[PDB]
C-alpha cells in the first residue's frame, strides 16, 4: 500500500492506534468523482427535472437575501458546473473553466455574492487581496520541525483545486500577487522556484474576483479602462466582465427596501412562485451534470463564426 497516498486527497485511512515509547497509526487499508451513483441520490435529481424550468429555478435560488441582478446570478450558476476539459491527443489541454469578474460601485452586495458561492461549492476558498500576499496565495515554503525538510504548504490557489476561488478586492492587490493569476487563467499551473524547489503545481480553480473603482464611484465621463486600475491583458482572459452600476431609482429602491425588511423579520425569503432549493440538494445536481460531457453540433458551428464577425466589427468601430 506504500507509494499510493497523494498530498491533498481526502480518503478514509483505516488502521490501529499503537503508541511508540509519540503516537503513530499503522496503515492497514486506504472530490466530484468520489460521489457514487446512489439510487437515493438519483431519485432527488429527477424530481427537479420533471418540475420544469430548471435553469431559471437554480438561478433564483442562489443568494436569497439579494434582490435583483437576474443576469448576474445566471453567470454564477454556470461557474459551479463549467465546461468540458477537452484533452487533445497531441498534448494540448483546453481549459474548461469560466473566468467571471464582477465590477461596479461597492454597494451591489459584492461581499455577499462571493461568500454565497463559497459555501455551495465543496472546494471553495474565500480570500481578500491585501490580507493574502504572494506567499499566502501561491505556496509557503516552510521548514519541517521534525524531518527538517522543506515542504510546500498549500495556500489559496492550491487547496481550492477543482473548485471556485473567491478573491475579494482585486483592484487593491499588489504587483507581485498577479504573477500566479496569469498562469492559472492560461495553463492552470503555478510555477514555484523558491528554496531550490523548481516544481509546478496544478491549479484548476475558478477565479471569481471583484474589482472596485479607484475614485469610489464610477465616472461616466472617463474611459472604462482608466476608471479601473487593471491592465487590458487581464480583461482579455476574463470571459464575462459585469458592471453593476448603482443607478439611483425610485422603483428599484422601493422594491429593495421591502426585501431587506422581510429578511430581518422572518429570517427567511419572501414567498415567490417557486420553492427555494436547499444547498444540500444543489450539490447533487451540479456533481451529476459534471459527468455528462456535451458535444458541439455541426449545424451550430456556423452561428458561432457569424457571431464572432459581428462582435469584432462593433468593437472596431467603437475604438475612438
Amino acid at each position: 500500500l506504500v507509494r499510493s497516498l497523494s498530498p491533498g486527497d481526502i480518503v478514509d485511512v483505516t488502521g490501529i492506534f499503537l503508541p511508540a515509547p509519540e503516537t503513530y497509526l499503522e496503515a492497514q487499508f486506504v472530490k466530484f468523482a468520489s460521489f457514487s451513483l446512489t439510487s437515493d441520490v438519483e431519485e432527488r435529481v429527477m424530481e427537479l427535472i420533471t418540475s420544469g424550468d430548471v435553469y431559471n429555478r437554480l438561478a433564483k435560488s442562489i443568494a436569497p437575501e439579494i434582490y435583483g441582478n437576474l443576469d448576474v446570478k445566471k453567470a454564477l450558476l454556470l461557474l459551479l458546473v463549467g465546461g468540458v476539459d477537452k484533452r487533445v491527443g497531441d498534448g494540448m489541454k483546453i481549459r474548461g473553466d469560466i473566468n467571471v469578474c464582477l465590477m461596479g460601485d461597492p454597494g451591489v452586495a459584492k461581499s455577499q455574492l462571493l461568500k454565497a458561492i463559497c459555501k455551495i461549492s465543496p472546494r471553495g476558498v474565500y480570500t481578500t487581496g491585501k490580507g493574502s500576499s504572494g506567499v499566502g496565495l501561491t505556496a509557503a515554503v516552510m521548514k519541517d520541525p521534525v524531518t527538517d525538510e522543506m515542504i510546500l504548504e498549500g495556500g489559496a490557489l492550491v487547496l481550492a483545486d477543482n473548485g471556485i476561488c473567491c478573491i475579494d478586492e482585486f483592484d487593491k492587490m499588489d504587483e507581485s500577487d498577479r504573477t500566479a493569476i496569469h498562469e492559472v487563467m492560461e495553463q492552470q499551473t503555478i510555477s514555484i522556484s523558491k528554496a531550490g524547489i523548481n516544481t509546478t503545481l496544478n491549479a484548476r480553480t475558478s477565479i471569481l474576483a471583484a474589482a472596485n473603482p479607484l475614485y469610489g464611484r464610477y465616472n461616466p465621463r472617463l474611459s472604462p479602462l482608466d476608471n479601473i486600475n487593471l491592465p487590458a491583458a487581464l480583461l482579455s482572459r476574463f470571459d464575462i466582465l459585469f458592471l453593476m452600476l448603482d443607478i439611483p431609482s425610485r422603483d428599484d429602491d422601493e422594491k429593495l427596501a421591502e426585501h431587506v425588511t422581510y429578511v430581518h423579520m422572518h429570517n427567511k425569503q419572501p414567498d415567490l412562485d417557486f420553492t427555494p432549493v436547499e444547498p444540500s440538494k444543489m450539490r447533487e445536481y451540479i456533481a451529476y451534470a459534471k459527468t455528462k460531457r456535451p458535444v458541439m453540433s455541426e449545424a451550430v458551428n456556423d452561428y458561432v463564426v457569424q457571431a464572432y464577425i459581428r462582435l469584432r466589427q462593433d468593437s472596431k468601430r467603437e475604438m475612438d
Binding site: 436569497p64 437575501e65 455577499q112 459555501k119 430581518h264 429570517n267 427555494p276 436547499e278 444547498p279
Partner: protein, 93 residues
Amino acid sequence: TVYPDFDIRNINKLSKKKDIFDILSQSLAPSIYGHDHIKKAILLMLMGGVEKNLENGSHLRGDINILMVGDPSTAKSQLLRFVLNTASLAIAT
C-alpha cells in the same frame, strides 16, 4: 478538578416609563459633560442587534460599529475606558 426575583421586578418597573432612553444614556459617563448624541450610540452598541440566521446557512451580522474622528482628548480617550468597565466582556487593544 477544574472549575472554569427582586432584580427582575425592578427591571420591569422602570421600563414602564417613556424616558428610559435618556436616563440610561446619561448614566454611562456621568463625568463626561455633554455629548448626548454620542452616549446614545454606545447604549445600542452594548445591547446589540438580532443575529438573523437564514435557512440555507447564510448568517447576518448584528453588531454596531462606531467610529469617532475628532480632535485628540475630546471625550474619546477617557470614554473608551468606561466601556471596558461597564461591559461584561471587553479587551483593551
